[PDB]
From Swiss-Prot:
It comes from Hepatitis C virus genotype 2a (isolate JFH-1). It comes from the Viruses. Highly N-glycosylated. The lineage of its organism: Viruses, Riboviria, Orthornavirae, Kitrinoviricota, Flasuviricetes. Forms a heterodimer with envelope glycoprotein E1. Interacts with host CD81 and SCARB1 receptors; these interactions play a role in viral entry into host cell. Interacts with host EIF2AK2/PKR; this interaction inhibits EIF2AK2 and probably allows the virus to evade the innate immune response. Interacts with host CD209/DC-SIGN and CLEC4M/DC-SIGNR. Interact with host SPCS1; this interaction is essential for viral particle assembly. Interacts with protease NS2. The heterodimer E1/E2 interacts with host CLDN1; this interaction plays a role in viral entry into host cell. Coiled coil: none annotated. Forms a heterodimer with envelope glycoprotein E1, which mediates virus attachment to the host cell, virion internalization through clathrin-dependent endocytosis and fusion with host membrane. Fusion with the host cell is most likely mediated by both E1 and E2, through conformational rearrangements of the heterodimer required for fusion rather than a classical class II fusion mechanism. The interaction between envelope glycoprotein E2 and host apolipoprotein E/APOE allows the proper assembly, maturation and infectivity of the viral particles. The chain holds residues 684 to 719 of 3033 of the full protein. It is a single-pass type I membrane protein. The transmembrane regions of envelope E1 and E2 glycoproteins are involved in heterodimer formation, ER localization, and assembly of these proteins. Envelope E2 glycoprotein contain two highly variable regions called hypervariable region 1 and 2 (HVR1 and HVR2). E2 also contain two segments involved in CD81-binding. HVR1 is implicated in the SCARB1-mediated cell entry and probably acts as a regulator of the association of particles with lipids. It is found in: Virion membrane; Host endoplasmic reticulum membrane; Host lipid droplet. This is Envelope glycoprotein E2.
């Protein structure tokens, strides 16, 4: 149903992570929060 292509699985997965972890990553933020 819908998505008459099925040729964009890994591509969609990358956008899903690059569009969520970019805002919920805080990798460098936590490194400067526990020591300051």
């Amino acid at each position: 149903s819908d998505l008459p292509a099925l040729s964009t699985g890994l591509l969609h997965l990358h956008q899903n992570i690059v569009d969520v972890q970019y805002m919920y990553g805080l990798s460098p933020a936590i490194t400067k929060y526990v020591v300051r």
